[PDB]
Design a protein around this ligand. Structure first.
Ligand SMILES: *[C@](C)(OP(=O)(O)O)C(=O)O
Ligand SMILES: *[C@](C)(OP(=O)(O)O)C(=O)O
Ligand SMILES: [Cl-]
Ligand SMILES: [Cl-]
Lengths: 421, 421
């Protein structure tokens, strides 16, 4: 379909950029609207992304009324009617994150039918942590012709120790627990900012959720939740993507209203590399002198460690620094596909299992490249800014799941970039 | 788009099956036709596959005349004219194996322009072994706007120790060596049957290639090669796929004219599992009693070890054996994607890095599933034969690269299977 075309070199980025609401918070926040049996829920700062339109179809398919005012970045949900139980294959097959309606359907309805997710290109993503935790809460799981068929005669709390701090499983279990009998304790919980924002929404709806952001979340079940109005937290991955873009072009960019505390492990590694990062009244400013950039080691880890969703973009910055950088991806088994396409731009990298070694300063050239996944697409476009000549990036269906107007925002900062239909 | 629909649970396969010429031999054999400056080359037993049509476009684009008589399974090549140098992005981006014209173009023309391959879904596949070996032969490598630019002022032999026995790099280097000055020795060479068949063709064309099938290939360069007529070796992966299908359905199938020596590590593991494998005058017969199948351990390795191109299909057979089987995939890093789609059919598997553990005897159900790659597609269809209910397999573009008439061959053995347009 469309292509993004970048004229390489001389793309120093200068100016200010507005960041959308978080893709990875709005999807579970929309799932949470099913819990409210009284009042309507309004989410503000909603990003206009393909994944949001799909989740609105999933929630609407449960007999909730979903209205998306795109100009106002607002979604209104009326879940006060009789909620139904099915999340069909036609939606789950297009977006794995659809799975986070399982918990709220079980809490509100007591039974659910959710298509089992299949393979994902960036790694094996089994949902046993979701299903094991729900079984501990009294849910009987069957699987029939591709569907998870879940029944809770009397959903109840459980003391769950997570083998891994799964973001999606933590969200599913927290939401199921809000209307379960008694207390649920999730040990080794995901600590990501999106977990915190979901807990804020649930507490605004009349739930009793404590500890979000720590390794232990405690939920005290209640009889019913109420709708509320809530601003989606800023997208820290879109914010971090523009911080990386500023750093690798020797730019000076103000990322408007960026949250320092969400951006911590990225900001610390940018400061270690020699990038300047300044907290100002209107946002976080990122500036760099290209000759000051030094190679670093990064290891992706569950929050508060370095976020896997920033890894591909950070490897693009490692290409311009001085020395050999090392990126260790521990969260996803197969998230270095962008480094394979970057070979076409002249980038040599050494990949052994979960570790990529990248010598900075190689003389890259623009080439025709194809996106394999959302963050890989952004990493290819960022590398196109610094390569010599013209880069053409295709398979933009991936970029459109998580960035709104990426080429327009880069062009207003001074990049020679166009999106051609 | 097209779908394969399987009615499962009762699909004992009985009868005889014809196997096509090898997709992994015909592609390098077609590249080798560029070496012949006198006489035309005729390949017989050519399979009707999408990859063959692309390779015919690559070779035709070098100013060789390529005629494919599909009814006769015959390709005729006239490379006696002035051969050109470019293998463009529009072909390499659709088929990585296009890269094996680099060696023969350098041998025949002395310069080449070949699009650099990018990412592949089943694993990182860098071509450094190809380029390092060509540099040792006097080729100067540049990279410009996505293309490998290669020039050999006077191509010559080299004593190359391969870091890994790469099939494609071994093919590229042995073809380049045929017209180089002096002797080339490839240590730690690929030993696969497709290497042996390519060496047979080169020797029939007047080359001096010795040692194919062993860890050391020696090539003595000559001035020019001549066209010849050659039967493509039988596809041992299609043959092995029907051996696995017979075993997992408790069938009795004669795989016509199968070559025992090419099928060795697969046959030995089938015998260890309890399958009966009988060498007969018309082919290799595979029979099994389902209650006799026992779990086994398999590790993929370079030939003569167990072939990675049989791994996915063999994991489908592991689902019906008694006990816990283990599959270690050492050749590719991302080749367990079919096991994630198989969770939709009810299959639980434990995947840690390169190792998959599969408990046999789980009660699988048919579901709608999507192919991720060629051998994964075959593995999903085979699992559909034994699951209870209807399996629908999509994304058949992958299957069509390596199997001709797969659903028709299974239906004539008794499978309840249809390909719907
Ligand atoms: C991965 C990216 O999951 P999703 O697309 O989000 O369902 C995939 O399917 O490749
Ligand atoms: C792998 C399968 O290589 P190819 O398709 O053969 O070029 C890929 O590109 O996914
Ligand atoms: Cl389904
Ligand atoms: Cl021979």
């Amino acid at each position: 379909m469309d292509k993004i075309v970048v004229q390489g070199g001389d793309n120093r980025l200068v100016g200010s950029v507005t960041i959308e609401g978080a893709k990875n918070a709005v999807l579970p926040l929309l799932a949470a609207t099913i819990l409210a049996s009284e009042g309507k829920t309004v989410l503000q700062n909603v990003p206009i992304l393909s994944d949001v339109f799909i989740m609105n179809q999933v929630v609407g398919g449960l007999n909730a009324k979903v209205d998306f005012d795109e100009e106002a970045h607002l979604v209104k949900v009326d879940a006060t009617g009789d909620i139904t139980e099915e999340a069909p294959y036609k939606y789950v097959s297009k977006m794995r994150a659809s799975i986070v309606v399982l918990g709220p359907i079980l809490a509100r309805v007591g039974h659910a039918k959710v298509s089992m997710p299949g393979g994902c290109t960036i790694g094996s993503r089994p949902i046993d942590l979701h299903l094991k935790g729900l079984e501990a809460m009294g849910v009987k799981i069957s699987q029939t012709a591709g569907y998870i068929e879940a029944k809770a005669e009397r959903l109840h709390g459980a003391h769950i120790y997570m083998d891994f701090p799964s973001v999606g499983a933590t969200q599913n279990l927290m939401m199921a627990a809000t209307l379960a009998d008694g207390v649920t304790v999730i040990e080794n919980a995901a600590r990501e900012p999106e977990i915190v924002d979901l807990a804020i929404l649930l507490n605004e709806m009349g739930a009793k959720v404590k500890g979000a952001g720590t390794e232990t979340i405690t939920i005290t079940g209640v009889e019913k939740l109420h709708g509320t109005t809530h601003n989606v937290v800023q997208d820290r991955i879109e914010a971090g993507t523009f911080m990386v873009a500023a750093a690798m072009t020797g730019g000076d960019v103000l990322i408007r209203d960026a949250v320092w505390e969400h951006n911590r492990p990225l900001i610390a590694k940018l400061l270690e590399m020699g990038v300047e990062v300044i907290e100002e009244d209107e946002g976080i400013r990122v500036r760099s002198q290209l000759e000051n950039l030094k190679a670093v080691h990064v290891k992706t880890l569950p929050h508060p460690g370095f976020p896997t969703d920033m890894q591909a973009q950070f490897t693009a910055l490692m290409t311009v620094a001085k020395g050999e950088s090392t990126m260790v991806e521990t969260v996803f088994e197969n998230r270095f596909q962008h480094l394979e396409e970057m070979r076409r731009m002249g980038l040599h990298s050494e990949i052994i299992r979960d570790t990529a070694r990248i010598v900075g300063g190689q003389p890259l050239q623009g080439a025709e490249v194809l996106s394999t996944d959302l963050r890989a697409s952004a990493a290819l476009i960022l590398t196109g800014l610094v390569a010599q000549g013209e880069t053409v990036v295709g398979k933009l269906v991936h970029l459109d799941r998580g960035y709104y107007g990426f080429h327009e925002k880069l062009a207003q900062l001074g990049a020679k970039i166009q999106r051609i239909e």
